[PDB]
Design a protein around this ligand. Sequence first.
Ligand SMILES: CN[C@@H](C)C(=O)N[C@H](C(=O)N1C[C@@H](Oc2ccccc2)C[C@H]1C(=O)N[C@@H]1CCCc2ccccc21)C(C)(C)C
Ligand SMILES: [Zn+2]
Length: 117
Amino acid sequence: MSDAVSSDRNFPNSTNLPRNPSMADYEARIFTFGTWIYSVNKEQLARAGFYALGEGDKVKCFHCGGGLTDWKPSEDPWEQHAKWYPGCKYLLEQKGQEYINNIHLTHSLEECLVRTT
Ligand SMILES: CN[C@@H](C)C(=O)N[C@H](C(=O)N1C[C@@H](Oc2ccccc2)C[C@H]1C(=O)N[C@@H]1CCCc2ccccc21)C(C)(C)C
Ligand SMILES: [Zn+2]
C-alpha cells in the first residue's frame, strides 16, 4: 500500500505554495546572482536548475550537485550541466535520457540559420 505523502492531491497543507515563478523564482534566483551579467539572463540559467550562493558568478546545481563558475560569453545551462554531470531530476525527465545522452556526445543547438553564416 503506497502511502504517498506528497504526490496525490493538491493543497499539501498551507504554506507550501504551488510555484509562483514571478515571485520566488525569476526575481528570487536573479536576486541571488545580482545585476551583473555575462551571457544569458541568470534567471534562464536558474530555471534549468541553478542558484547563486551570494557571491557573484559562483553558482551550483540543485540536487544533482556540481558547481559551475567562470561562464562562457555564449552558452546555455542545459548543455553545460548535461555535459559536465547529467544527473538533474527535471532536466533529465524534461527531454528524456535520449536528449541528455545526445547532448553529451556532439555539438548541439544553433540550427537553421539561412546557410550557416
Ligand atoms: C566554458 N564552460 C565554463 C562554464 C567552464 O567549464 N568552467 C570550468 C568550471 O567552472 N569548472 C570545471 C569543473 O571541473 C571538472 C568537473 C567535472 C569533470 C572534470 C572537471 C568544475 C568547475 C569549477 O571550477 N567549479 C568550482 C570549483 C571550486 C568550488 C566551486 C564552488 C561553486 C562553483 C564552482 C566551483 C573551468 C573554467 C573552471 C574549467
Ligand atoms: Zn544539475
